[PDB]
Design a protein around this ligand. Structure first.
Ligand SMILES: N[C@@H](Cc1c[nH]c2ccccc12)C(=O)O
Ligand SMILES: N[C@@H](Cc1c[nH]c2ccccc12)C(=O)O
Ligand SMILES: N[C@@H](Cc1c[nH]c2ccccc12)C(=O)O
Ligand SMILES: N[C@@H](Cc1c[nH]c2ccccc12)C(=O)O
Ligand SMILES: N[C@@H](Cc1c[nH]c2ccccc12)C(=O)O
Ligand SMILES: N[C@@H](Cc1c[nH]c2ccccc12)C(=O)O
Ligand SMILES: N[C@@H](Cc1c[nH]c2ccccc12)C(=O)O
Ligand SMILES: N[C@@H](Cc1c[nH]c2ccccc12)C(=O)O
Ligand SMILES: N[C@@H](Cc1c[nH]c2ccccc12)C(=O)O
Ligand SMILES: N[C@@H](Cc1c[nH]c2ccccc12)C(=O)O
Ligand SMILES: N[C@@H](Cc1c[nH]c2ccccc12)C(=O)O
Ligand SMILES: N[C@@H](Cc1c[nH]c2ccccc12)C(=O)O
Lengths: 66, 66, 63, 66, 66, 63, 63, 66, 66, 66, 66, 63
């Protein structure tokens, strides 16, 4: 059951969950300050994740460091 | 369930989800500005994903960049 | 479910979904201009995919 | 759920589906011109696939390039 | 379900499917001329496949050529 | 389901299917002439396979 | 079920469990002092985990 | 669903099936002459196999050549 | 089901299990003196494990020592 | 289901199956003379196998010889 | 279905099972003298295992030799 | 189901099966003399195995 690891590399990074279903809207925005990590799953409610700001991101497919 | 990772390499990248089913239309477009990342699942509503604009994309099959 | 990755290397590449079932016809053609990417699954409705135009294609079997 | 990748290397290549069941007959013939690719699954209706003409073919078992 | 890949190395190759069940007879023969390829599943009707003629054959177990 | 690959290296190779169940007898013998190939599955009806004659044989365990 | 490993490298590291469901709020914060280790699963109730403070973190994806 | 490969290296090799159940007795003995191969499964009726005589034997665990 | 391995590197190491569910409290603490080892599963009652004191810990993800 | 491979290195090797269940007794002993091989499954009746005499034994865990 | 291998390296080593459920208490203590081995599963009744004394311990995660 | 391989390196090695359930007691001890081999499964009835005496032991975790 897949998840994403997200480490903020600066202040005020946002990790935003988007709603599962016919409709797509942001249901929640988690704020990360520098060096804070968010380990976040895809779930019954979240089918897409947006990251804004400079962040090191780990997934099953590998790494993308801003 | 499988997911794509999309990082924007310029401003104004569109990640477009196509409806699952007999019919195919765009149901949602997500604008990504430079540096921003979207990780998006295939879902009971999205069976095809379309990226317009300069992107770095990881899937289960490998990298595809530009 | 398995999927294909198609990157258009010219304008007007067509990604064509053929119908699942006894009958085979196309039900949709997605057009990509140069540089655009389609990630497309096999589904309840699409059992074959035809790309026409120059494309870089990735599947579970390789490039 | 297995599939075959078929890339025509000349004009007028045919990819022919054969019917699943007691009876075997061609139910459909897809024409490929040079450089067109067909990614085709085995399905409830197709249990065999014939390719006529010069074609690069990819499957789980590897490659056969005419 | 598993499948065989047969490429004809001369004209007039026969790919023959044998009936699944208590009884065993040929139910279908597919003629392949030189260069042509058949990818054929084992099915609820075919439990044994027979190739006559010069062929290149790939299965899950490896190559067998001539 | 698992399968065997048999290539005949002489004329008149016999691929013999033995019956699944309490009783063991052959129910079928498929004959191959030199160069012919049989790919044969274990099935509801065949639980053992005997090859007689010179053959190159491939199974999941090797050659 | 998958889990995370968190080792605190300062005092007062917070391991925060965010709620599973339509609503997202924290339901618990576990505090670790320097050197302490939390191994924590994703559960029926926690679908996201935020670490705040300097920590060495291990997941199935690496360090 | 496990099987054993047995190749007789001399004349008059026996491959003997033993009965599954509380009771153990030989239910069948297959005779192999030199260079004959038997590919034999474990089944609802056979839970042990005995080989007598000089034989090359292949299983999941590797090879034992008399 | 997955488990952790904890070896105490000093006297007085605490292995604490946290309750699974909507609520989170300590339900049990296990004191380990130097040299002693605990292997503990995640369970229908414990969804998070906490180690205080100098420990060597192995999990499915690797070693973590001190 | 898993199986053991036993090759006799001398005459009079015994392969003994122990009953599965609350009780444990020998239910069958199979004499193997030198060179002979037994491949025997664990079954709904045999949950432990005992070899007396000089044997070469392969299991899923590796070789054990003498 | 996971298990732990435990080999006592001195006299009077204890392997203690702890109860599965809301409650945690020692339900059993197995005494090992030097060079005795215990191969012990996690079960419906045992969700944690404590080892006291100098012992070589093998699990899925590797080795810890006192 | 998983199993253990025990080869006795002296006379009178005991392979002891401990009972599965709330209660833990031995229900059986299989004795091996030098050179004898026991391959033994974990079962509905045996959840722990104790070897006493010098033995070479193989499990899924190694030797
Ligand atoms: N509401 C959409 C969210 C989504 C997932 N993947 C996407 C890809 C593109 C656009 C939107 C999406 C869905 O559940 O399907
Ligand atoms: N069949 C999908 C859309 C789709 C997937 N792959 C395709 C390839 C080409 C065209 C459309 C598609 C649907 O449910 O609508
Ligand atoms: N209508 C066909 C489409 C198809 C899938 N694979 C094929 C291979 C060859 C020809 C057609 C096909 C089907 O569902 O079966
Ligand atoms: N009607 C046949 C088609 C087929 C599949 N594999 C074959 C091999 C040989 C000949 C025919 C076939 C079937 O479904 O079984
Ligand atoms: N048992 C298959 C045919 C078959 C498979 N493998 C064989 C080997 C030898 C002879 C026949 C067979 C059937 O259903 O008829
Ligand atoms: N009639 C036997 C055929 C068989 C399978 N494997 C064997 C091994 C040895 C002897 C006979 C067999 C059965 O179904 O069980
Ligand atoms: N309440 C959210 C928590 C969450 C999980 N993954 C996320 C990713 C982004 C934002 C929030 C989340 C949910 O269960 O779906
Ligand atoms: N009747 C026995 C046959 C058997 C299988 N494995 C064995 C090992 C030893 C002795 C006999 C056996 C059974 O089904 O269990
Ligand atoms: N959600 C778990 C506890 C838990 C797991 N991971 C966490 C991370 C942070 C906080 C609490 C937790 C519970 O059932 O109570
Ligand atoms: N528990 C098995 C026998 C057994 C398996 N492993 C053991 C180890 C020791 C003693 C007995 C056993 C039975 O059903 O009887
Ligand atoms: N009674 C506890 C035992 C336990 C398992 N893992 C633990 C970790 C820490 C403390 C206690 C435990 C349970 O079944 O959950
Ligand atoms: N009666 C115990 C036997 C046991 C298995 N693993 C253990 C670990 C430690 C102590 C006892 C055990 C049980 O079934 O649970």
């Amino acid at each position: 059951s897949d998840f994403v690891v997200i480490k903020a590399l600066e202040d005020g990074v946002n990790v935003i969950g988007l709603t599962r279903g016919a409709d797509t809207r942001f249901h929640h925005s988690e704020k990360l300050d520098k060096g804070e990590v968010l380990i976040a799953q895809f779930t019954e409610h979240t089918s897409a994740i947006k990251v804004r700001g400079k962040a090191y991101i780990q997934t099953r497919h590998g790494v993308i460091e801003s």
